Paper text:
Our subsequent work demonstrated that the HEPN protein with a RX4–6H motif is the toxin which cleaves mRNA in vitro in the HEPN/MNT (SO_3166/SO_3165) TA pair in the model psychrotrophic bacterium Shewanella oneidensis. Furthermore, antitoxin SO_3165 binds to toxin SO_3166 at a rare 2:6 ratio to form a hetero-octamer, and this binding is important for the antitoxin to block the toxicity of the toxin.
To further confirm the role of the conserved MntA GSX10DXD motif in mediating adenylylation, the structure of the HepT/MntAD39E, D41E hetero-octamer was determined at 2.35 Å. The substitutions of DXD with EXE in the GSX10DXD motif also reduced the ability of MntA to neutralize HepT.
Numbering used by the authors:
A (entry chain G): 2 to 131
B (entry chain F): 4 to 127
C (entry chain H): 3 to 133
D (entry chain I): 2 to 101, 106 to 133
E (entry chain D): 2 to 104, 106 to 133
F (entry chain A): 4 to 31, 34 to 127
G (entry chain B), H (entry chain C): 2 to 133
The structure:
């Protein structure tokens, strides 16, 4: 389905941008410009995964979630993704909310740990869906 | 309810039509009463508002019932979500239906986060 | 207290938009500085939405049926001018594209907003503060 | 017949109150009470026309209308009104739902371009 | 559910506009424009309550309403509204014909409804907002 | 249409009731229109109490009801009840008295007002 | 019928009121008050006759009288009163309208001619009606 | 307006006729002929006012009266007559309706009260109108 195809290409395109942009990582906890780029491309990864999830929930007639977190819950309850992946992608959404709408409480250590260790929830989602 | 008459009338009257939905009461069991037939359309352009109201009354006369014709391109996000949720697609490609649904549900999810405090206020 | 906070991040975000853009020069060519501008433009738009929605809640102006409707509600109760309501709803539309399908975000419009429409954010916070 | 007579008078009273309340239109889009008044009087005009149509359908034995729109359909099938006048009166039946922000443009449109249809209907009726 | 929510918001907006247009009553009695506004907004309240009732009858699968009034008795039979509130909302169903009676004689009725039955709409939406 | 229910509700709620008429379309079901009922009592009905009683009939009949007080109703409307109405209750003498008074008043009204309706009817 | 009986009684009471007030006739064309009293009791006679007519047309579904005179016309088309008596009663009504509503145009001699020669029309109408 | 002035003159002559015939009142209740004359001229005053009202209703298209009283309601609805005065004239129509349709049920005590205290309700109506 072209919807999934385009969202998947977006997820890969954007996680490469996060990696290129967060290079050695030394210019990260200072320098807000590169923080902005990483946070935006993380949102675009989240939004594309949420669109995939929203699309599948409607087509498989699982219910229409009125929040992005309910959308991943619905895929877990019907066993289209493993629940380990469900709760980690819910964490990404939760971190985007803070990173975009409320940086002044953004830890940024959690961002950097997500940049290095938890991106591998997006690949895992791309691989399951495909 | 004659769905083929609905499809022909809108196809004949709306340029570059893309999606026809029946929604509301007449989809999912039809509710008799004086209730309107609720129809939503997506075309390449926004319809002229007055021309859309005229088209609705022309459908209303053909169907012998009150018709409400909703242009999805200018409709609210709440209303687009209802069409996406309970609507029955009468015409248009499956891909145009999925593009519209994905865009709608995403916009609706962002709206719910934005306005949840207003909804909780007025509901208690 | 929320409005003071939201107004504070709008000013702070407008500042970060202005430095990163600086002189047009090469913003069309390096994607990282567009990401910073685009994100901070989205933050300005979404902070304005939450200002509108806070006012809509405490004054019981109604229930927004779309993100744009948050400013329409303000205009229908004469708390903002309708030319300004229209300009902010134009920002909501760009927000909608940037978050839902970022690749169709035309950049000539992004730079048209950085050049000539950041004032709409400042006019909005100036009106809301004055009330 | 007093029902015909009184309904005609109700239609003309409502038309003049629509013209009077609408005026030039400058304030119409700002005062919700002028809008309410015009809408309510449009609905009264439409209902009075349906009552005339139904009274005529019964008294002259044309048929039994199955809806408000069928009341006018019966009049047109027997050439008591023309098909375009019938179709324009059917359009007005939809106003029953116009009360329940952009349909303000429909109301203005109807005031400017379809008030003549009520007057055309009662002129055809007056000439029996 | 957005239908329930929006209908509740419509009822409150209409109640507020009935109160502010009716005001003290001195000049309600002979300004047909104020009378028309109150009548129409009473009819919107009535229609909005019926739609709420029908939506609940459907989603609670309480039965198919056989009429506008039956929609309320179905709510009362399942104990979601009290019987006197049900009876009071049925009385309001009559208001759809108050404009089309062609006879002051009905305007004493309208002021009666404004002063003693307007609270019935407010009572209904509070009962519903339990959910 | 349940005429016994209409009769019992009016008898139980109107003091010194004299006449009950069904008029309009239901005296001729038809459509979605109101059930039209006319009553004559020794006193005029309170206007608000009459409306409340109409809705009580409306609830019991599950249909819109219009209750008309003949003692305060216009001569035109009284003429319509007299012409097309179906009497549901009351003596035959009280119906005939009401008809004679009504028809006479109407004929005198037609004389006074015939220039007005000629003028209005083009 | 009690309505017929009372209206009959009223016509009789009012004809005697006319004969008694008009007397020999020497003072009628002079005295406004005697004219007023004759004219009023003529009106009452006419209204009592019209009420009888309106009653019978409704009781026997002969039609809806479009006017007080049309009520006599309908009785005549059903052959319950003669066409001559119908026409006389109808011109009585016309004289009543002139006498009451337009006295300045009233020809007082037709009232006298009616008082002398046409009160029998009321009595003829009474006799036919009760001979039912 | 030619018809209005004629009706105004008829009311003034009928008002004087009532005052003349009623006199001091001491014999009004024992002479049926004086009752007839006053009652008749009361009716003429009422019906002349009704014609005046309908002439204005027709000329200004104020509406279609649904009863005789409604003729005065329409002028009060358009602020052309005093609401106190409209109510008084409509009460006078009710008196007329009893006098014309069922004269035996007239209450002479209200007839006297109208002659003594309410004849210039007619006079209020005449002047107001005329000062159009």
């Amino acid at each position: 389905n072209d919807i999934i195809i385009n969202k998947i290409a977006t997820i890969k395109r954007c996680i490469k941008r996060i990696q290129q942009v967060y290079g050695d990582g030394s210019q990260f906890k200072q320098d807000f410009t590169l923080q902005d780029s990483v946070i935006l491309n993380l949102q675009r990864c989240c939004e594309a995964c949420i669109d995939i999830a929203n699309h599948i929930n409607r087509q498989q007639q699982l219910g229409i979630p009125q929040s992005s977190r309910d959308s991943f819950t619905l895929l877990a309850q019907n066993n289209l993704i493993t629940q380990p992946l469900s709760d980690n992608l819910k964490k990404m959404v939760g971190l985007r909310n803070i990173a975009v709408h409320d940086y002044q409480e953004l830890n940024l250590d959690i961002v950097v740990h997500v940049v290095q260790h938890h991106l591998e929830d997006f690949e895992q989602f791309i691989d399951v869906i495909k | 309810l004659n769905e083929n008459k609905i499809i022909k009338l809108l196809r004949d009257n709306i340029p570059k039509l893309q999606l026809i939905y029946l929604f509301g009461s007449y989809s999912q069991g039809t509710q008799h009463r004086n209730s309107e037939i609720e129809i939503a359309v997506l075309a390449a352009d926004t319809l002229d508002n007055i021309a859309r109201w005229e088209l609705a009354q022309k459908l209303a006369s053909a169907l012998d019932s009150d018709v409400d014709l909703v242009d999805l391109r200018s409709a609210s996000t709440v209303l687009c979500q209802q069409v996406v949720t309970q609507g029955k697609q009468l015409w248009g490609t499956q891909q145009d239906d999925e593009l519209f649904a994905v865009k709608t549900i995403s916009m609706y999810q962002h709206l719910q986060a934005e306005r949840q405090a207003i909804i909780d206020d007025v509901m208690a």
